[PDB]
């Protein structure tokens, strides 16, 4: 309300420059991300995510499940292993929808990475 | 805030038919649609394990037990008969529900035999 | 209601196998579709549409505005002219969202084409 | 039923910066965001007239009057400085409203000069 309000698609959070740690094309299962990283970016298990590959430029859509907390895992499995490889630097983002007013004051959850998937607030 | 969540996935089915010239839609055995919660005419993503292509389309139901995965029309440029593919659909819901949501996943081997019981 | 209902993305309608009639990369303006065809497929002016190119396999997302009724126009303009050319056979679809119950009994608006963009119900 | 509608578009801007290695986001002059109704952190599509590539990302605001169109991070693989691109965002609303919706379109020439009055 107002009913019929125009709804925006906004960046909810992203993991900026994580490094892919595992990639298995033949995997019977999902992509996975350390739960600590999900938490920092506000990303949920089984939430749609975009992955934008800094190393090779590929851009694709998938979902991930939680890897154990503290594992530092970024696993890109199944068909998505044709789009990322271990060592590649990627950006992982999720988007949510909300009405325009809320969108204009929204602050995304952004976590920045370096080194061995070490996470910084800024 | 509204989240986009995996609703369900058919993991590792084989394309059985692919007709570029079809006057009609892609089709999936209704038993596989049933297992993954995927509806006739719902938006689906198809991720091709054999060639890496990733595309979006929709499917209607094929006859139960036919094991059909048919990728027709323009989509026949992105998969061929015998390719292994992963098919998923996504739904939206508020954050509060999405935190406990569980998707429907079905796994397959061989000639489209669903790992079942 | 129930509040929080799971919302599906469903095919609202499509134009099956129309032929692209104009394509201008340098165009200051939009893609356009004869209003009669929009009407048959339930597609709106300025609605997001997917175009799946049967001739060259490209798949892309755009929007169109109404061309004059009866012109039989399918015009693919701007950057999208790198994805379709005059003569190419394409499928144009739109998707809408709705709750799961409604989705299970939804019937999309499908119009089939042949010849000089002559439209049939079946 | 909920429709996805064009909210607004920047038609024919030139990319002014493209840094693959950026610790940060794509950026657009706030005056251009203002003209097309596009928000900081909103999902946008970028359609590259010069090379045909089409991708999705988001942007934050660049300084007013800077004329900046900066395509950074992985997206720097899809556009270069001097490419002409079209940037759009989409919103959703019920069918009843979408029937009369009007998007915000701004047209440009030259060095990112918005056709204005």
Author numbering:
A (entry chain A), C (entry chain A): -4 to 117
B (entry chain B), D (entry chain B): 1 to 117
Article excerpt on this structure:
The pyruvoyl group is formed via the intramolecular rearrangement of a serine residue to generate a backbone ester intermediate which is cleaved to generate an N-terminal pyruvoyl group. The activated protein therefore consists of two chains, the N-terminal β-­chain and the C-terminal α-chain, which includes the N-terminal pyruvoyl group formed from Ser25.
To further investigate the role of Thr57 in activation, we determined the three-dimensional structure of the T57V mutant. The T57V mutant ADC crystallized in space group P6122 under similar conditions to those used in previous studies and was subsequently cryoprotected using sodium malonate. Three bands were observed for all site-directed mutants other than T57V. The hydrogen-bond interaction observed between Ser25 and the β-amide of Asn72 in the WT zymogen is lost owing to these changes in the torsional angles of the chain. The presence of bound malonate in the crystal structure leads to displacement of the unprocessed chain. This means that it is not possible to determine whether the observed conformation in the zymogen is owing to the hydrogen bond between Thr57 and the carbonyl of Gly24, but it may be that the very lack of this hydrogen bond is critical in allowing malonate to bind.
